[PDB]
Amino acid sequence: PGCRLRSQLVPVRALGLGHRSDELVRFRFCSGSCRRARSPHDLSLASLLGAGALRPPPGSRPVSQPCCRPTRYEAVSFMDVNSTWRTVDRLSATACGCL
Amino acid sequence: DPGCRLRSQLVPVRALGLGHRSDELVRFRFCSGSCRRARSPHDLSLASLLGAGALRPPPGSRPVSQPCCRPTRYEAVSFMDVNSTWRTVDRLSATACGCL
Amino acid sequence: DSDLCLKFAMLCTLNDKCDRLRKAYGEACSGPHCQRHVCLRQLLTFFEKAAEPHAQGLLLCPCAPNDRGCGERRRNTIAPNCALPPVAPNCLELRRLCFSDPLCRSRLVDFQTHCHPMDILGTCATEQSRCLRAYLGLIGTAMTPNFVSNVNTSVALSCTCRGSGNLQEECEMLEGFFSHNPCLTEAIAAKMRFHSQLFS
Amino acid sequence: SDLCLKFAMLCTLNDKCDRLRKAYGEACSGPHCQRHVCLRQLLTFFEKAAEPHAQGLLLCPCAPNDRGCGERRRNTIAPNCALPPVAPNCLELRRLCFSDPLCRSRLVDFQTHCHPMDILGTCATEQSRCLRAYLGLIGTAMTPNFVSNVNTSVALSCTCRGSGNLQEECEMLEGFFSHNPCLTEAIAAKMRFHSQLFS
Ligand SMILES: *[C@@H]1O[C@H](CO)[C@@H](O[C@@H]2O[C@H](CO)[C@@H](O[C@@H]3O[C@H](CO[C@H]4O[C@H](CO)[C@@H](O)[C@H](O)[C@@H]4O)[C@@H](O)[C@H](O[C@H]4O[C@H](CO)[C@@H](O)[C@H](O)[C@@H]4O)[C@@H]3O)[C@H](O)[C@H]2NC(C)=O)[C@H](O)[C@H]1NC(C)=O
Numbered sequence: 001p002g003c004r005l006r007s008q009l010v011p012v013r014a015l016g017l018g019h020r021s022d023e024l025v026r027f028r029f030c031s032g033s034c035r036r037a038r039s040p041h042d043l044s045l046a047s048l049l050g051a052g053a054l055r056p057p058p059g060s061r062p063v064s065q066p067c068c069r070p071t072r073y074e075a076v077s078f079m080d081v082n083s084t085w086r087t088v089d090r091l092s093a094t095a096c097g098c099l
Numbered sequence: 100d101p102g103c104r105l106r107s108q109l110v111p112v113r114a115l116g117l118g119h120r121s122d123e124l125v126r127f128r129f130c131s132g133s134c135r136r137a138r139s140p141h142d143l144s145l146a147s148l149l150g151a152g153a154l155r156p157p158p159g160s161r162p163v164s165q166p167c168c169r170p171t172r173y174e175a176v177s178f179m180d181v182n183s184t185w186r187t188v189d190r191l192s193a194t195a196c197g198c199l
Numbered sequence: 200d201s202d203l204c205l206k207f208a209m210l211c212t213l214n215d216k217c218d219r220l221r222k223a224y225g226e227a228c229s230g231p232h233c234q235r236h237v238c239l240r241q242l243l244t245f246f247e248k249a250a251e252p253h254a255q256g257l258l259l260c261p262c263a264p265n266d267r268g269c270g271e272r273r274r275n276t277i278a279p280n281c282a283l284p285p286v287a288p289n290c291l292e293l294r295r296l297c298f299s300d301p302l303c304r305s306r307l308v309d310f311q312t313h314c315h316p317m318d319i320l321g322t323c324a325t326e327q328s329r330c331l332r333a334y335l336g337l338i339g340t341a342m343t344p345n346f347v348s349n350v351n352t353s354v355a356l357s358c359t360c361r362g363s364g365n366l367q368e369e370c371e372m373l374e375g376f377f378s379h380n381p382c383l384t385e386a387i388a389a390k391m392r393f394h395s396q397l398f399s
Numbered sequence: 400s401d402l403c404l405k406f407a408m409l410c411t412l413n414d415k416c417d418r419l420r421k422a423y424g425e426a427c428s429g430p431h432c433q434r435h436v437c438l439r440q441l442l443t444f445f446e447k448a449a450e451p452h453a454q455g456l457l458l459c460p461c462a463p464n465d466r467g468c469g470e471r472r473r474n475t476i477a478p479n480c481a482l483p484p485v486a487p488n489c490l491e492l493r494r495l496c497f498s499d500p501l502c503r504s505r506l507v508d509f510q511t512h513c514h515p516m517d518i519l520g521t522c523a524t525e526q527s528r529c530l531r532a533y534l535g536l537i538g539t540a541m542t543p544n545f546v547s548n549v550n551t552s553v554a555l556s557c558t559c560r561g562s563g564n565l566q567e568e569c570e571m572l573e574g575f576f577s578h579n580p581c582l583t584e585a586i587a588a589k590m591r592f593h594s595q596l597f598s
C-alpha cells in the first residue's frame with residue numbers, strides 16, 4: 001500500500017527487449033504512496049486540486065507527493081528462442097525510495 | 100508544452116488550505132508534465148509491461164514508469180489576511196522543476 | 200463586493216513586475232519577527248521599481264467612509280508595525296536621523312520641492328503627479344509617512360512634537376508639512392477619485 | 400511447452416534456484432564472455448542448488464523431433480562461453496584437471512561412482528551418486544555436455560587427434576562418457592523419471 005519493492009513473474013516477451021523468449025522472469029519494481037513527510041507545497045497543491053482551483057495543465061496532472069521510485073537495480077538474464085543466454089543490466093529494481 | 104515544466108496560476112489564498120484567512124489571490128507555481136526523455140532501461144521495460152497488460156495491480160497506487168516532474172526549488176507566498184496583517188508561508192510555491 | 204483597496208492590490212498581483220516587488224516587501228515586512236532595515240529596503244525598492252500608476256493604486260486607494268476593513272487594509276499596506284519604530288520620537292530628532300543618510304536627505308528635499316503649496320488653495324509648487332511621486336519616495340526612509348486612520352484619509356510621519364520644548368513651532372511646521380498640507384491633500388484626493396472612477 | 404522449459408521455470412519459481420541460475424546466466428552471457436568467471440558460477444550453481452532442481456534443469460527429457468527442447472538442454476550450461484573455442488586433446492584436459500585440487504577431486508569422484516559394473520548399467524555405487532559426480536564436473540576443466548540436440552549422448556570438449564603413442568589411453572577416457580552403460584542408464588532413468596513425474 002505504501003511505497004515498497006514489488007515482485008512478479010512476467011513474460012520476457014513483455015519486457016520490450018527485442019530478443020524473443022518463451023521464458024518468464026522475476027521482475028521487480030517500486031510502487032505505493034509517499035504520504036509521510038508531507039510538505040507545505042504538496043499540502044497546498046493537494047488542497048488546490050481538491051478545491052478544483054487549478055485548471056489542468058497540458059499533459060500529465062501534477063503530483064502532490066513524492067513518487068515511489070527505484071534507487072538501485074540488478075540485471076535480468078534468460079535464454080532466448082535460439083537457446084542463447086542474454087542478459088540486460090540494471091533492468092530490475094532491488095530497492096525503492098520516496099523521491 | 101506537455102513536458103515537465105514550471106506552471107503558474109492565480110488562485111484564491113482560501114483554496115491553499117492554510118488556516119490563515121485571506122481575501123487575496125496569489126500566483127501559485129507548481130511542476131507538471133512528461134519525463135519520458137529521462138526514462139531508464141528499467142522504466143522502459145516497466146512501461147512495456149504495463150502497456151502489455153503483464154502486471155497484476157499491486158495494492159495502493161499504480162507504479163510510475165518515468166521520473167516525476169517535481170519542484171527543485173521553492174519560495175514563500177505572502178499576502179495580507181482578513182485582519183489586514185501581512186502573513187508569509189515559506190516554501191509554498193515552486194520556482195524550478197526537475198524530472199526527479 | 201470586494202473593496203477597491205483589495206482590487207488595487209490585486210491589479211498589482213496581475214502585473215508580473217509589481218507582483219514580484221510587492222511579494223518581496225510583504226515577505227521582508229511580515230511576522231512578529233521582521234528585520235526592520237530589510238523591510239525598509241524592500242519598501243524603497245518597491246516604490247523605486249514598480250510602475251508609478253501601480254504603486255499609487257496600491258497605496259492611494261479609495262475607501263467608503265464607513266468601510267473600516269478597507270481603511271485598515273490601506274493603513275497596513277506598507278506594514279507599519281514592521282516599518283516604523285514602536286516608539287514615536289520627536290519629529291526634529293527623526294529629521295536629524297534622516298539628515299544623517301544621504302538618500303533620506305535627498306527624498307526629503309524632493310518632497311519639500313514638489314509638495315510645497317504655492318497658495319492657500321493647495322496648488323503644488325510643480326504639479327500634483329510630481330508631489331505624489333516625492334511623497335511615495337519617502338516610504339522606506341527614516342521619514343516614512345502613512346495613513347493614520349481607518350476612517351479618513353489623513354497621513355502623518357510617525358513622530359510627535361510633544362517634548363519639542365523652545366522649538367515647538369519648528370517641530371509643528373515639519374509635522375504639519377505632512378499632516379495638514381493642502382497641496383498633498385488635494386493631490387491624494389484627486390488620485391483617489393480617479394481610482395474610484397477607473398473601477399466604476 | 401517442452402519439459403526442459405518447464406524445469407527451467409520450476410527453478411525460476413524457486414527463489415533460491417532462480418538466484419543461482421541468473422547468476423551463471425549473467426556470467427556466461429554475451430559474446431564478451433569471461434570463461435573463468437562463467438565456470439566459477441556453474442560450479443557454484445551445481446554446488447548450491449537443490450539437487451532435484453539442478454537435475455531437472457539439465458537432465459530434462461525431450462520428445463523425438465523436438466529440436467528446440469534439445470537445443471535448450473544442450474545450451475543450458477552456456478557451452479559457447481564455458482568451453483574453450485578450440486578443443487584440446489582429451490588427455491591434456493585430464494592433465495589440466497589433475498593440476499587443480501578441486502578438479503582432481505571431482506574427477507576421482509566421477510571415476511568412483513560412474514564406473515560400470517556390467518552392460519545393464521549397474522554402477523560401482525548408486526545411480527544417484529553417479530549423477531551427482533557427473534554434474535560435479537560442470538564448471539571444471541573437464542566440463543561434460545550434450546553433443547546433440549536430437550539425442551542424449553554426452554561428452555567432453557576434446558579430441559583424440561594428435562595423441563600418438565597415447566591413442567588407446569585417450570579413447571579409453573572418451574569412452575568413460577560415450578561408452579559407459581552406468582552413466583548412460585543413470586541419465587536415461589532420470590529423464591524417464593522427469594517425464595513420468597510431470598505426466
Ligand atoms: C482622522 O482620524 C484620526 C484617527 O481618529 C484623527 O486623529 C486623531 O485626532 C484627534 C484629535 O485631534 C487626536 O486627539 C489627540 O490625542 C492626543 C493623545 O494622542 C495620543 O494618545 C492616544 C491614546 O489614546 C492615541 O490614539 C494617539 O496615538 C497618541 O498616542 C491628545 O493629547 C490630544 O489631546 C489634546 O487635544 C484635546 C482636544 O482639544 C484636549 O482635551 C487635550 O487637553 C489636549 O490638548 C488630542 O486629544 C488623536 O490623538 C488623533 N489620533 C491619531 C491616531 O492621529 C484625525 O483627526 C482624523 N483627521 C481629520 C483631518 O479629521
Ligand SMILES: *[C@@H]1O[C@H](CO)[C@@H](O)[C@H](O)[C@H]1NC(C)=O
Binds near residue numbers: 549551
Ligand atoms: C548423437 O549425435 C551425435 C552427433 O550428432 C553422434 O556422434 C552420436 O553417436 C549420437 N548418439 C547416439 C546414441 O545416437
